[PDB]
Short mmCIF file of C-alpha atoms and ligand atoms in Angstrom, two decimals:
data_model
loop_
_atom_site.label_atom_id
_atom_site.label_comp_id
_atom_site.label_asym_id
_atom_site.label_seq_id
_atom_site.Cartn_x
_atom_site.Cartn_y
_atom_site.Cartn_z
CA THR A 1 -1.05 -8.58 -18.24
CA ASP A 2 0.18 -10.77 -15.28
CA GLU A 3 -0.70 -10.41 -11.52
CA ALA A 4 0.37 -7.69 -9.00
CA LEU A 5 0.66 -7.67 -5.17
CA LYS A 6 3.04 -5.26 -3.32
CA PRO A 7 5.14 -5.95 -0.16
CA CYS A 8 3.93 -4.32 3.08
CA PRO A 9 6.28 -1.42 4.15
CA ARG A 10 6.35 -2.88 7.75
CA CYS A 11 6.73 -6.69 7.31
CA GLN A 12 7.20 -7.19 3.48
CA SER A 13 4.18 -9.61 3.39
CA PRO A 14 2.02 -9.65 0.17
CA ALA A 15 -0.59 -6.98 0.95
CA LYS A 16 -4.11 -6.85 -0.65
CA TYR A 17 -3.37 -4.53 -3.59
CA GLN A 18 -5.95 -1.85 -4.57
CA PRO A 19 -4.60 -0.17 -7.81
CA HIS A 20 -8.04 1.50 -8.38
CA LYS A 21 -7.59 3.25 -4.93
CA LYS A 22 -3.71 3.44 -4.94
CA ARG A 23 -3.96 1.55 -1.59
CA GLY A 24 -2.44 -1.60 -0.02
CA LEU A 25 -3.62 -3.52 3.11
CA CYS A 26 -1.37 -5.97 5.03
CA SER A 27 -2.29 -9.71 5.30
CA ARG A 28 -0.44 -10.12 8.70
CA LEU A 29 -2.85 -9.73 11.68
CA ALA A 30 -0.08 -8.55 14.10
CA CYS A 31 1.01 -5.86 11.53
CA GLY A 32 -2.36 -4.67 10.05
CA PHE A 33 -1.01 -1.74 7.95
CA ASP A 34 -2.61 0.68 5.44
CA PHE A 35 -0.23 2.24 2.87
CA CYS A 36 0.11 4.39 -0.25
CA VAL A 37 1.28 2.18 -3.19
CA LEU A 38 3.28 5.06 -4.82
CA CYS A 39 5.49 6.20 -1.83
CA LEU A 40 5.21 3.21 0.64
CA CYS A 41 4.19 5.44 3.62
CA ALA A 42 0.96 5.42 5.71
CA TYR A 43 -2.04 5.95 3.36
CA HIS A 44 -2.85 9.62 2.49
CA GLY A 45 -6.05 9.19 0.37
CA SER A 46 -6.72 12.03 -2.14
CA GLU A 47 -3.46 13.95 -1.30
CA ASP A 48 -0.31 13.85 -3.53
CA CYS A 49 2.92 12.01 -2.48
CA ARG A 50 6.15 13.66 -1.11
CA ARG A 51 9.85 13.89 -2.24
CA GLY A 52 12.90 12.40 -0.40
ZN1 LIG B 101 2.57 -6.00 7.21
ZN1 LIG B 102 1.88 8.46 -1.54
#
């Protein structure tokens, strides 16, 4: 099994990982970011990710 926590796309800090919501929230109070864990952009909820 093992643990999982993803780096924040702004500051690379270990963000609070939410695999049940495909969401990640930064632990750095000056950064305070909310991202999609599939494409590492600002969180887009129920929408699908984008190519690049
Ligand atoms: Zn951050
Ligand atoms: Zn995405």
